[PDB]
Paper text:
One system used by E. coli is the Cad-system, that consists of the cytosolic protein CadA and the membrane proteins CadB and CadC. The pH-receptor CadC senses a drop of the external pH and activates transcription of cadBA below pH 6.64, 5. CadC belongs to the family of ToxR-like receptors. ToxR-like receptors are characterized by a conserved modular composition: external signals are sensed by a periplasmic sensor domain and are transduced through a single transmembrane helix to a cytoplasmic DBD of an OmpR type, which acts as effector domain to regulate gene expression.
To characterize the CadC effector domain and the interaction with DNA, we first determined the crystal structure of the CadC DBD (amino acids 1–107) at 2.0 Å resolution. The overall fold and secondary structure is characteristic for the winged helix-turn-helix (HTH) motif found in members of the OmpR family effector domains. Thus, CadC comprises a recognition helix (α3) and a β-hairpin wing (β5-loop-β6) within a compact fold with the topology β1-β2-β3-β4-α1-α2-α3-β5-β6-β7. To our knowledge, the CadC DBD represents the first structure of a ToxR-like DBD. A unique feature of the CadC DBD is an additional short β-strand (β7) that extends the highly conserved C-terminal β-sheet (β1-β4) in OmpR-type DBDs. Consequently, the β-sheet in CadC is shifted towards the site of the β4 strand to maintain a compact globular fold. The additional strand β7 is important for the structural integrity of CadC, as a truncated variant (CadC1-102) was less soluble and unstable. The highest structural similarity of CadC1-107 with an effector domain bound to DNA is found with PhoB. While SAXS data of CadC1-107 alone are in excellent agreement with the crystal structure (χ2 of 0.98), analysis of the CadC1-107 41-mer Cad1 DNA complex indicates the presence of two domains bound to the cadBA promoter DNA. We have recently shown that the CadC DBD is not per se dimeric. This is confirmed by the monomeric state of the DBD in the crystal and in solution as evidenced by our NMR and SAXS data.
Author numbering: 1 to 107
Write the structure that this text describes.
Protein backbone atom coordinates (compact mmCIF):
# COMPACT_ATOMS: atom_id res chain seq x y z
CA UNK A 1 0.00 0.00 0.00
CA UNK A 2 1.60 3.21 -1.21
CA UNK A 3 2.31 6.44 0.68
CA UNK A 4 1.84 9.80 -1.06
CA UNK A 5 5.01 11.86 -1.12
CA UNK A 6 3.53 15.24 -1.65
CA UNK A 7 0.36 17.18 -1.73
CA UNK A 8 -0.22 19.66 -4.60
CA UNK A 9 -3.22 21.81 -3.92
CA UNK A 10 -6.03 19.31 -3.39
CA UNK A 11 -4.15 16.28 -4.83
CA UNK A 12 -1.94 13.73 -3.11
CA UNK A 13 0.64 12.43 -5.36
CA UNK A 14 2.00 9.04 -5.27
CA UNK A 15 4.73 8.78 -7.97
CA UNK A 16 5.65 5.22 -7.27
CA UNK A 17 2.34 4.15 -8.97
CA UNK A 18 1.83 7.35 -11.04
CA UNK A 19 -1.23 8.34 -9.14
CA UNK A 20 -2.96 11.42 -8.04
CA UNK A 21 -5.75 11.47 -5.64
CA UNK A 22 -8.49 13.81 -4.22
CA UNK A 23 -11.36 13.07 -1.73
CA UNK A 24 -12.24 9.71 -3.24
CA UNK A 25 -10.97 10.33 -6.67
CA UNK A 26 -7.91 8.32 -7.78
CA UNK A 27 -6.32 8.95 -11.22
CA UNK A 28 -3.31 7.36 -12.91
CA UNK A 29 -1.32 9.64 -15.21
CA UNK A 30 1.35 9.04 -17.68
CA UNK A 31 4.81 8.93 -15.95
CA UNK A 32 6.11 12.01 -17.77
CA UNK A 33 3.20 14.00 -16.42
CA UNK A 34 3.88 12.82 -12.92
CA UNK A 35 7.45 13.85 -13.42
CA UNK A 36 6.33 17.31 -14.64
CA UNK A 37 3.96 17.67 -11.69
CA UNK A 38 6.72 16.59 -9.29
CA UNK A 39 9.13 19.13 -10.84
CA UNK A 40 6.60 21.89 -10.42
CA UNK A 41 6.04 20.92 -6.75
CA UNK A 42 9.80 20.96 -6.00
CA UNK A 43 9.96 24.51 -7.53
CA UNK A 44 6.53 25.67 -6.49
CA UNK A 45 5.59 29.22 -6.67
CA UNK A 46 8.60 29.83 -9.02
CA UNK A 47 8.44 30.92 -12.65
CA UNK A 48 9.81 27.99 -14.72
CA UNK A 49 10.78 28.44 -18.33
CA UNK A 50 9.98 26.04 -21.19
CA UNK A 51 13.71 25.45 -21.20
CA UNK A 52 13.97 24.49 -17.46
CA UNK A 53 11.04 22.05 -17.95
CA UNK A 54 12.63 20.45 -21.01
CA UNK A 55 16.03 20.03 -19.40
CA UNK A 56 14.68 18.57 -16.19
CA UNK A 57 11.61 16.61 -17.16
CA UNK A 58 12.63 15.44 -20.65
CA UNK A 59 16.32 14.58 -19.79
CA UNK A 60 17.99 12.49 -22.58
CA UNK A 61 15.14 13.07 -25.11
CA UNK A 62 14.95 16.01 -27.50
CA UNK A 63 11.46 17.45 -27.72
CA UNK A 64 10.01 20.47 -29.22
CA UNK A 65 8.88 23.48 -27.34
CA UNK A 66 5.49 22.34 -28.47
CA UNK A 67 5.55 18.88 -26.66
CA UNK A 68 5.94 20.88 -23.53
CA UNK A 69 2.95 23.03 -24.27
CA UNK A 70 0.80 20.00 -24.95
CA UNK A 71 2.04 18.24 -21.82
CA UNK A 72 1.17 21.27 -19.84
CA UNK A 73 -2.42 21.23 -21.29
CA UNK A 74 -2.76 17.52 -20.42
CA UNK A 75 -1.59 18.03 -16.84
CA UNK A 76 -3.93 21.07 -16.39
CA UNK A 77 -6.72 18.96 -17.65
CA UNK A 78 -6.02 16.08 -15.29
CA UNK A 79 -5.57 18.48 -12.31
CA UNK A 80 -8.90 20.15 -13.10
CA UNK A 81 -10.63 16.78 -13.45
CA UNK A 82 -13.72 18.36 -14.92
CA UNK A 83 -14.43 20.49 -11.80
CA UNK A 84 -15.12 24.07 -13.05
CA UNK A 85 -14.71 25.33 -9.49
CA UNK A 86 -11.02 24.22 -9.46
CA UNK A 87 -8.26 26.72 -8.95
CA UNK A 88 -5.59 27.35 -11.41
CA UNK A 89 -2.83 24.89 -10.66
CA UNK A 90 -0.38 25.86 -13.36
CA UNK A 91 -0.43 29.52 -14.45
CA UNK A 92 1.07 30.82 -17.62
CA UNK A 93 3.43 33.74 -16.96
CA UNK A 94 3.40 35.73 -20.15
CA UNK A 95 6.65 35.54 -22.17
CA UNK A 96 8.35 33.67 -19.25
CA UNK A 97 6.88 30.20 -18.77
CA UNK A 98 4.77 28.64 -15.99
CA UNK A 99 4.22 28.80 -12.26
CA UNK A 100 2.63 26.39 -9.84
CA UNK A 101 -0.03 28.41 -8.00
CA UNK A 102 -1.29 26.04 -5.29
CA UNK A 103 -0.01 25.08 -1.82
CA UNK A 104 2.47 22.16 -1.69
CA UNK A 105 3.01 19.90 1.35
CA UNK A 106 5.94 17.40 1.30
CA UNK A 107 5.54 14.11 3.24
ZN1 LIG B 1 12.76 25.61 -5.70
ZN1 LIG C 1 13.81 26.23 -9.03
ZN1 LIG D 1 2.34 15.95 -25.59
ZN1 LIG E 1 1.25 13.41 -22.29
ZN1 LIG F 1 -1.50 11.43 -23.65
Amino acid sequence: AQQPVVRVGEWLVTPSINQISRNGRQLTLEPRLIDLLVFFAQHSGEVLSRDELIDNVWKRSIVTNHVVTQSISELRKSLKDNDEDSPVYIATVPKRGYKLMVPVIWY
